[PDB]
Symmetry: C4
Subunit: 38 residues, 4 copies
């Protein structure tokens, strides 16, 4: 499933290292100012 | 070959985590406002 | 425990590659303008 | 000991994914607007 985070963002490119590091996930999206990982 | 994305960018440095995570590619380029991976 | 860096930042998303590269750590936080890793 | 790049940057945090992807290197520095890796 998806993993929402508390990491703030303004663009989805910013979410890829977070999503990889924290959850081993290879897809990230910046959704309402927060990284969401899937 | 190259793998285009829907990830918006304003500089090529932004594309490296996306290109690595999604496709295992070691180069990203911001091309017409979108990340391209190779 | 935590490992400080002198890598400058304005948001915590920026610190994830730094913390991974330097210390193998999967959490980064931008704390007073510098990456801190844990 | 460094590996220079043609990747444009404004801050050293931006160079960590570049340096990892291209050269397997765990340190990046933004030097005169370009990523340098070591």
């Amino acid at each position: 499933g998806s993993r929402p985070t508390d990491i703030k963002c303004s663009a989805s490119y910013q979410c890829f290292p977070v999503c990889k590091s924290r959850f081993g996930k290879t897809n990230g999206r910046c959704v309402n100012g927060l990284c969401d990982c899937f």
